[PDB]
Each structure stands twice: as C-alpha cells, then as structure tokens.
C-alpha cells in the first residue's frame, strides 16, 4: 500500500495484498510479565548488596529487555548463596539497620535462601534512566540544547538514591539472582542485536551428535 | 501563649518548600502557605503542615540534603507584641488526620 | 491530501491567545496517551492549581539544516527550557509543577529540496549511542520531508516516576531533530533550511509557593 | 500470571506474597498496533 | 462582645492558602459595595482572565505610633504598592488589571494603652487639607481603640473612571491611618504600638499580555 | 483554630483550613499486634534463662515499643540455638524443675528449636514498670513526695518475681529470640528518638550502587 | 491477626496454640483520637 510516510501512523500490510493468507500467531512468549519472570545472576559485593535491578548486565535477556523500557514496576524474588544469616532492610533504611535481626533475617539453610520481597520505593514507578539529579544542595540543572556532544555532561550521574528494593547483608554473599515479579513496562527504548562484521552473524547452533 | 493578661502578641507560621532558601522576614514569608493569629481568651492555635513533595512518600531518616529526606522548612515569626517581652509561647506537635508511617525498620537508636 | 503545485492539508492549532496555521499538515502525533493521568494526587495534599495563562506558544530556533550534515546529526532541546514569560516565572514561584507539551517543528525550504528530518519527543534522554538512532522511531515522532511537508506536530503528556516534578533538578522530555537523509538543494531548492520550534505547555499545574526575595 | 504454573492456591495471603496496589480517581501499544492501516490506498484492478 | 479580661469577638479571614485570625474583632467594614461590578466589559474584548493565585495576603509595616504624634498625624500607603510576589509579577506581564482589596490593619499594644486610630480606604487621594481630616469618616473606615480592639478590617471593591486600570500610571486607593486621639501609655501600657497592614487583592483580573525582554 | 490550650482535649486541624485536602491513610504498620510480632535477639545466659521480655534491649524496635506501654499482655514464641535438650518450666516453678524432662523438653534438632508458649503469669496483665515491692517481710514502702531526686531510692528494685513467662534450660544456649504473640498494650509512656548534636540527625541511607 | 499470613487453618487446636481468655461480668486512645475538635473556633470570612 502506499501511505504518507511522514505521518508515523502505523501501516501493517498483509500477504493478502498478493494472494497469501495471514496465519494465527501465539505470542505468549513476548508478554512482558512472562519473559521478565526468570532469575538472572548478578556479581555480588562481599557483604552489603543494595538490591538495584540496574545491576543486571545489559546484554543478558532480563538486562536487555529491562533497559528497553523507561519506567517499570515489579515485585521481586532473590535467591542468595551466603555465609551467616541474611538480613534485608526496605528502601529508605539507614545502612546500619542491616546489622539488626528484627529486620527480615533468614537463618542459613543450605544450599541458598530464596525470598519474595515487595516493591518498597516511595515512587509510583522506577526508571531505568533518569535525566536529573536527586541532591538538592547543588546549583540548578542546565537546560541543555545542542547536538549529541551536549549529553556527555551527564555521565557522572548515578540514578537517584530512592531507586532500589532495599538491601541485603550476610557475612559473605557468594551468589545473587534477581527475578522480577508481576512486571510492568512503559515507554519503549532501543534494543540492540550484536552488530555483524559479515553479511550474517553466524554462531554454532546446537546440532546432533556426530 | 503563656504571658499575663496585659501581654499581647501577633504571630505567623509559614511552610517554606524546598528549592529556595527559607524566608528571613514575615514579608518574604507572606508568599508561602502561612497563618497569622494573635493572643486573647484562647491560648492555643493549631496549624497543619501539609505534605507537599514530588513522591508519594518521604523518608523519616536524613542523609545529606536531598528530595526524598528534606522537605523544606517551618518558619515561626513574630509580627509584633505589646509588652510581651520575655513571655514564652510553647510548642507541641501531634500527627494529623492522614499522617501515615510505613515500612518497619530496626536501626540501633533511642 | 489536496491540490495543484501547493496544498490543503490545513491545520490551525490554538493554545491560549496564540494560533499557528500550516497548509502542509500531515496530522498530529499523540505520544503514549490521548489525555493526562490524574493531576490531583496524594503528594500535593489538594494544594495544587491550574494556571491557564501559561498554556500558549513560545518560540526558539533549533539549528540550520545544511548539505554537510550527515545521517545521525541531531539537535536536542531539553524541556523545560528558558522561558522569559509567565511559564518561566512559575518555575521560580512554585516548588512543584507538571505539564505536557504541544510541539510544532518547522523546516521551511521549498518542494525542490530533498532529504529528510525525523522529529521525536524522547523521555529521560540521558545518552544515545549512534546505533540507537536506528530505533528513534520507538518514540513519539513525525518526519519532515520537503516534497510533502514543512511541519511536524507531536502532542505528548507529562511522564515521570513522580506525579509532580521539580524542574530545577529534572528534565522529563527532550525534543530531538535528527537528519535521516542529507539535505539536497539541486538548482531550485532553498540553499539551507532553518529549523524552528513553536512549543506550548499544556495542562500546567503548580503546587508549593515559594517565598519572595523581599 | 507471568511464569507461574501451580494449580493450587498459595499457602500465604495475597497481602503477604505481593505488594498491594492502590487506585486514584497492551494499554497504549496494543491500541497502537490494532489501529494500523492494513488496506490498500490505490483502486485495485483485478 | 465576649468575656473576662481578654475576648471572643473572634474572626478568621482566608485569602488563598493564607489565613489571619484575631480575637478582638469588631467586624468588617464593606466600602461602597458588597460585590464588584462587571469584570467583563467592552474594553477588554473578551480577552481578560482571573488569576486566583494572586488573591492572598501580603504584609507591610506602616508606622510606629508613639506618644508625640498628635491628632491628624497620618500614614498613607497608595495601592497597589511594591509586591515582590505573584501579584507584583502580573503588573509586568499584563497591560490592564482590576482587583478590589481586603485590608487588615493591626495596632497591638495592650488594654492599658489609650488613644485612638482611624483607619480608612480613600479613592483617588491626591491631597487632603487639615480641616478635611475631620470628615475622613466619609470614607470606608473603622477605628482602632486599645480598650476594645487591635484590628481594623475594611473590604473594598475596584473603583475607577475606567473598568480596567493601568497601575504603572494610576493608583485608585490609598490606605490612611490617622491618629485621632494621642497614644497614652500610663504605668502599664505598651511603650509604643507598631502598626502593620496585612492586605489581600481580591478578584484579580488581567488583560493584554506584554512581550518579554528576550 | 484557636482553642483553650490548658484543656488537654485533643485538637486535630486539617489542611482544609486553608484549602487543602486530607488524603486517606493506611495505618496497618503502627498496629500494636502487627509491629510487636517479629523476633528480637537477646543475650542469653549460659544455661538457665528466665523468659523475661524486659531482657530485650531498650533501643531495639520491640524493646523501644514494649517500654512505651505500662501494662501489656501477650503469648510468646521463642527460637533457641542450644546444645542438649531444652526444657521449659511455667511461671511459678521451682528452678530445680528445669532438670526434669516431663516438663516440656525439646530434643535437639539442628539448627534451632522454635516453640509456641502460653502466657502463664498469675496476674491479668504484666507491667514494664512497677512502683513497689513483692517481698513482704520488709518494712512498708514510703509515700514519697518531692522532686525528681526522690525517685533515686527505687533504682535497686527488681520487677516482681512473678513477672516472667517461665524459664528454659539446656546444656549451652547460644542464641535466644523472643516474639510477642497477640500483644495488647495499655497506658502509653515516652518513646525517645536519638538526640542530634546537629540540626538534623544524618545517617548513610541505602542508595544505588556506584 | 498480627504478622501472620497463612490461608489454611492451624493443624493444632486453638486451646493448644494459644492461652484461652476469660471474661468477667483502639478502645480508649481510638475514642480519644476520634473525639478531636477538627473545626475552627472563629467566624470565617471568605
């Protein structure tokens, strides 16, 4: 079909335009709740770990797809391999609270601890990217204009301190995995495949035996 | 107000929200949400400090001045007085009708 | 579309006592929603007010599109930007604010020019790698392509982790104009095209009145 | 509703297993993908 | 009136998000009318708007009432005066304006003082001879007399040969406080009484938006 | 609003007085039963431990809040890490009963023993503070009058012997935690935050990663 | 009723899991916080 390309109104043609037939599609696997709901390993800190979803590497399935949203919501599960007992403290806690056992503490039971945690941030939703500051006592943020170069001022910014699901602490934490529960994603952002050197990106794919 | 009967005064309480410096004068403070009252039969005046923030909750603990932990200032001014020199105004605080505390934490402390 | 050498795709947008009319319209792009969400939440304790006098067009120059600009040349404008009018004075009189944006971008050369501009409204734009520019169409956008049109119009709502913003520390939206195909002037096009924005804040709400400096 | 596939109800109350959501007062991209022009803009011969 | 050594003539006035309370009230004086006249006339061609955010109290010191001031000592305040808040910014953003005034004047000493103050709202006050001060009660007024009260409250509408004003060249109202009987302090009164005004503009309407300096 | 300050009748104004709007509040977390119902660690005695809620440090959440009541009721849970078997004996038992196994004795099963215990005191309610003596054979308690100084006579007083939930004994008890069940609190008493040196008490609060 | 969130009934009898309460024959501070004067004691102008 011809259309006005400048418009931005989505145009979806079908193989019927030249005598084919559109088939049925079952899209259960590209549903945000389902695909986000699997564990992903993170490299832990020896002892204090603040629970921050932006810790999962950007190349992973969950890191890739979490960064393709601007704002998101979820509850959380973690599974942790640790020495001693594991204490978790909600968003907003003083870090010295990590040492008090009335705060949710799980006693060591081999091989690991898996916990269901609530969303505790003070915000209706959290963001993978945030164009601003949370420290007050500063000078105002500039209203930047210019080309892409102008965006290099922002690289030393850390995401607001309120963007976390609390923190956990144990004597040694050896392994940490996150799993997003009931996930919601808003405002898509770029998702990048590997860029090939060749005409086609080629990989050894799993094939029979000999 | 705790002064004698021949001691008169007029006061102002203003809530100064974050993002600029808190007012130093009743006149600058006039542009905030504020209340003014004077002394008479009734010794007590009560004022609700409003919850105004970007987020829906804010922190009870403080760290370093940020969005989530400082919520501006409360400013108590004296407009004038008539012979109230030395008299005490005593102030108390209580939770409002929609005051809400959430997320228990034990953090050493008392 | 409609008729001989010039056109009747004709739109007049009104924002306050200011109007803008194009005869090469192409329509408006609504981003992420058709309406704002709730303006009156818990975080303002019923103390917020609409200030209808700020809902009107202000103007800024963006850049000059010339034949040496290549695919991926961008111009960003973070929003809100400096406003020396009644919107601008709100940001110094109230601690918290929220508004969406009705955005109109112009690139007038003539119909003998070629090349193409993508104009887009991106939230929380902190960084954009070169390869991601191939997916900028993910965002609320419209093209300016000389043979068809000279105006892009995008209308977008307030977005944010918080229902009211503090604009002195956070910029929710960035207007980005990107060159997707380089400008061609041939014998009859305009030697270059200056790109201008005409922007109106929409639905402006303020809360939390500041002291003065008196 | 994501990747969960138990046929019996949770031993714990929903107030415990998950945060509870509140109201004040697919979605956009579903509506957007449904709205797509699927036709033809010419006149069709044969 | 109401009870033992102090009193229950108790009034709370609200203007915007600002309140003022007195326990020695005496009531409010309405001058010339109970309502404003029509706000929407031919001279603004339907282009005028109300700006409710300016309707709230601002404060200024007037003078210090001392025992040497004699009958006829006055302090005038022309209205509008300098306002460094949102009302003040309206006068620089719009060519024409109209608003009435809700005026509250305070003179707190204690009930062992004597003497008397007349507070009055006079239109077009260009000159006042000494003998005319005997007829200042012709104007919207109220007294402050220590043995009874510490507050005067007058509420007055917009008045003028024209339905909208240009405040950079004309001042419709002057607050005047006049000493009618000299302050007495005896052994127990306040040594002097500072006089303060708490004023709110009411019904502010603006028309005719100015350029910026950009 | 103005009111008579001397009265003591509670006066609760709202933001409506100047045009605001009171919001809804969900107070499930400051409910006495819920907040009191979490374990808190106590420093155990090597062998005999009498179960006395006033053993939980005053600065903890449960110690802080238990001392903010005068009289209280609850059942109890304990979790105990111990060598050997753990015997518990009710309120009023001879201490030599701690060595007889027909009294509730739990046989060692790693890693710890958690037990539901009833309230056993002979009193309808117990108190965090008690202005008197339980030993008879004495001379009568004075009727003190005077300023705060007068209260220094009372410092050598121990809470009545009947104020306990029994006692437990094992060969070594290494860890002991209490958890108040079905708690009721009567007559509030002072609850003190930390006193700051500065204008604001500042603490490192749990923030993202870098 | 405190911090408990099981959806099935206790395997043990209530006579066993808890002490039983007896009768003879919120509360005060709820009544006290509800009784609070929330008004205005002046006369309100405007």
Automatic annotation (TrEMBL), chains A, F:
Localization terms from the record: Host cytoplasm; Virion
Ranges where the Picornavirus capsid domain occurs: 1-143
Domain of life of the organism encoding this protein: Viruses
Reported function: Lies on the inner surface of the capsid shell. After binding to the host receptor, the capsid undergoes conformational changes. Capsid protein VP4 is released, capsid protein VP1 N-terminus is externalized, and together, they shape a pore in the host membrane through which the viral genome is translocated into the host cell cytoplasm. After genome has been released, the channel shrinks.
Protein's name according to its UniProt entry: Genome polyprotein
Organism of this sequence: Foot-and-mouth disease virus serotype O (FMDV)
Shown segment, full-protein numbering: 508 to 717 of 720
TrEMBL record, chains D, G:
Compartment(s): Host cytoplasm; Virion
Role description: Lies on the inner surface of the capsid shell. After binding to the host receptor, the capsid undergoes conformational changes. Capsid protein VP4 is released, capsid protein VP1 N-terminus is externalized, and together, they shape a pore in the host membrane through which the viral genome is translocated into the host cell cytoplasm. After genome has been released, the channel shrinks.
Name recorded for this polypeptide: Genome polyprotein
Organism of origin: Foot-and-mouth disease virus serotype O (FMDV)
Lineage of the organism: Viruses, Riboviria, Orthornavirae, Pisuviricota, Pisoniviricetes
């Amino acid at each position: 079909t011809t259309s006005a390309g400048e418009s931005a109104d989505p145009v979806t043609t079908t193989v019927e335009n030249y005598g084919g037939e559109t088939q049925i599609q079952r899209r259960q696997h590209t549903d945000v709740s389902f695909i986000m709901d699997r564990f992903v390993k993170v490299t832990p800190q020896n002892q204090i770990n603040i629970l921050d979803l932006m810790q999962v590497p950007s190349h992973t399935l969950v890191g890739g797809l979490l960064r393709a949203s601007t704002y998101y919501f979820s509850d959380l599960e973690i599974a942790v391999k640790h020495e001693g007992d594991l204490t978790w403290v909600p968003n907003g806690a003083p870090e010295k609270a990590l040492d008090n056992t009335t705060n949710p503490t799980a006693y060591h039971k081999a091989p690991l601890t898996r916990l269901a945690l609530p969303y505790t941030a003070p915000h209706r939703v959290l963001a993978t990217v945030y164009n601003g500051e949370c420290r007050y006592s500063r000078n105002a943020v500039p209203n930047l204009r210019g080309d892409l170069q102008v965006l290099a001022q922002k690289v030393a910014r850390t995401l607001p301190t309120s963007f976390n699901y609390g923190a956990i602490k144990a004597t040694r934490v050896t392994e940490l995995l996150y799993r997003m529960k009931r996930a919601e994603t808003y405002c898509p952002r770029p998702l990048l495949a590997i860029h090939p050197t060749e005409a086609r990106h080629k990989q050894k794919i799993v094939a029979p035996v000999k | 107000f705790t002064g004698p009967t021949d001691a008169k005064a007029r006061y102002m309480v203003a809530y100064a929200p974050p993002g600029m410096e808190p007012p130093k004068t009743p006149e600058a403070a006039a542009h905030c949400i504020h209340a003014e009252w004077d002394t008479g039969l009734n010794s007590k005046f009560t004022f609700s400090i409003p919850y105004l923030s970007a987020a829906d909750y804010t922190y009870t603990a403080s760290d370093v001045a940020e969005t989530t932990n400082v919520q501006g200032w409360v400013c108590l001014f004296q407009i004038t007085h008539g012979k109230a020199d030395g008299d005490a105004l005593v102030v108390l605080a209580s939770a409002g009708k929609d005051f809400e505390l959430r997320l228990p934490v034990d953090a050493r402390a008392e | 579309e409609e008729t001989t050498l010039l056109e009747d795709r004709i739109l007049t947008t009104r924002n306050g006592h200011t109007t803008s009319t194009t005869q090469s319209s192409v329509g408006v792009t609504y981003g992420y929603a058709t309406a704002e969400d709730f303006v009156s939440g818990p975080n303002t304790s019923g103390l917020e007010t609409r200030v209808v006098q700020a809902e009107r067009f202000f103007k800024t120059h963006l850049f000059d599109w010339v034949t040496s600009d290549s695919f991926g040349r961008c111009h960003l404008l973070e929003l809100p930007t400096d406003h020396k009018g009644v919107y601008g004075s709100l940001t110094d009189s109230y601690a918290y604010m929220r508004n969406g944006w009705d955005v109109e971008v112009t690139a007038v050369g003539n119909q003998f020019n070629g090349g193409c501009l993508l104009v887009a409204m991106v939230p929380e734009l902190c960084s954009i790698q070169k390869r991601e520019l191939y997916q900028l169409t993910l965002f609320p956008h419209q093209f300016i392509n000389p043979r068809t049109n000279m105006t892009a119009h995008i209308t977008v709502p307030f977005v944010g982790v918080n229902r009211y913003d503090q604009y002195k520390v956070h910029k929710p939206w960035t207007l980005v104009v990107m060159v997707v195909a380089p400008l061609t002037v041939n014998t009859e096009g305009a030697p270059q095209i200056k790109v201008y924005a005409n922007i109106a804040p929409t639905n402006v709400h303020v809360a939390g009145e500041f002291p003065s400096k008196e | 509703s994501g990747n969960t596939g138990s046929i019996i109800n949770n031993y714990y109350m929903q107030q415990y297993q998950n945060s509870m959501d509140t109201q004040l007062g697919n979605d956009w991209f579903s509506k957007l993908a449904s709205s797509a022009f699927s036709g033809l803009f010419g006149a069709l011969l044969a």
